[model samples]
Target: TPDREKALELAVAQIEKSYGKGSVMRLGDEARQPISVIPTGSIALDVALGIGGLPRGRVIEIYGPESSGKTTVALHAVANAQAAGGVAAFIDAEHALDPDYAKKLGVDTDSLLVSQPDTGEQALEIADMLIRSGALDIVVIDSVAALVPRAELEGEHVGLQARLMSQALRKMTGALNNSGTTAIFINQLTGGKALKFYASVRMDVRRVETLKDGTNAVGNRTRVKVVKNKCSPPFKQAEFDILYGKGISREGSLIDMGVDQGLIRKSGAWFTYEGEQLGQGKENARNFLVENADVADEIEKKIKEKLGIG
Candidate 1:
């Protein structure tokens, strides 16, 4: 017994060296742990999610009220995954996926596999199979709240949704960890809170402000809360604006941070810095920052460091 244990110690030491320290390496038919993550693209969000991105081989949930930009955030992550030449699968049970918008968000329409399963059970089944198949690097189930179980569809039960979700998550957790595929479940919030379900990371999105350009609704600024994260510290918060036709603006984001830090001030269509007029309106303010290379550069560096982006 001692000899066998010694041999195992030696093997584990070698495995640790090969896989890097603390990595859960494969142990002769055992499931290996995930080592890397896919960044969400937004520097602020990437920092909020910890380790600079979404963890592979784990289940993540994004929840919010209607029009709170939940789907937009999830799609942003999908786009990031695609940008890295990774394959993705989107299970659109809600049937509200807009391919044109997704393309604009950086998703490779040709490379992303889309599936529409009828029931919650069916969606989980499909996701499980896809993860086990190892053909996809990321899988997204859009709006788990939309997923209804077959029993409920048949009118046999009115409260089976939670049960179904719990069972599905219980079954899929191991599969997700073993396969190292990044699985995301988009869900709807009930009274500003999400239904309790197993997840490695649980994020809550809320609309904080609307970006308007001279009385025209241009975009929305939303707050992303890392409500629960197993891979890193939880309760982290970050804000970003999603602009129409522009996507997430790092420059705009910097301005927002500047305003938060009191480095910039807004008063009736004018932005002032140090009691001196910088520009008028949001667009001009962003442009001013962009044109003033030295000032913008210093501010950008400070914000990046402050937000853990650097």
Candidate 2:
């Protein structure tokens, strides 16, 4: 403790001498290279994140409305990490993860460990133990809402307890990062406003319709912006579709509006069996279907005619 205090004092002294810019390599040292972090299966988001993937050894907190696909993104990240020749852990504080969901996401439970601690304190203890065990490649806390009990939130000692828990998680992230493991956290959006205060990385998931290729995509619109990326320059806005069953698509970037043609392009029907059409490899086919549904009918008819229409 004395050494740590001395180290802090020295750091403060360096900053004061530099006027906050003359510390060890400057007060704010930049990473020589960018971190590579995968998207939650959203291509546009991956690019926007600038790392092209979820950065290894960093923890990202995803918060949104109910059924906003928060867990979906978490599972996707887990799958990506597991596929990348590493292990992953899910700290299920609420005990909400289903085995079927993991199977659907293609996350090998054998490689992915789940820790369902009964209480917030238990969750912290379990997490500390796991990180110390050094057997995981990625560790995810399914929710901060579940881990921090209401007593810590509304109780008189809230501030002190929350600060302790926050530091604990941060230290765990540091430990896991030092071990070359990526960390993730799923957070619940308590209220509509105060987003920046509530989350370290705030992502708002909304429902919006955009016109693509003259057709409208009536689905959930998830807007992912970097509320806090103190590690790097915060990213621009990224949008994605909350698709059913299949989840988010990496091919779909942050599309502003859905044109009729764009909507058709989303459907694979625009591509031919050989994945070519109108010299655009499905672009023309999609436009045709978007504007003229009968155009597709005519093409099918032509195909049947060629096959002698059995």
Winner by TM-score: 1
Please write out the lDDT profile of model 1 over residues 26-80, one tens digit for every residue.
3222122235578664556766665667888888888888878788777878888
lDDT of prediction 1: 0.75
RMSD values for the candidates in order, in angstroms, are: 8.7, 12.7
Scanning candidate 2 in windows of ten residues, the lowest lDDT window is 252-261
Worst 10 residues of 1 by lDDT: 25-34
**Cα lDDT of model 2 overall?**
0.56
Residue 175, candidate 2: how far off, in angstroms?
Answer: 0.9
Each prediction's number of clashing residue pairs: 1, 21
lDDT of each: 0.75, 0.56
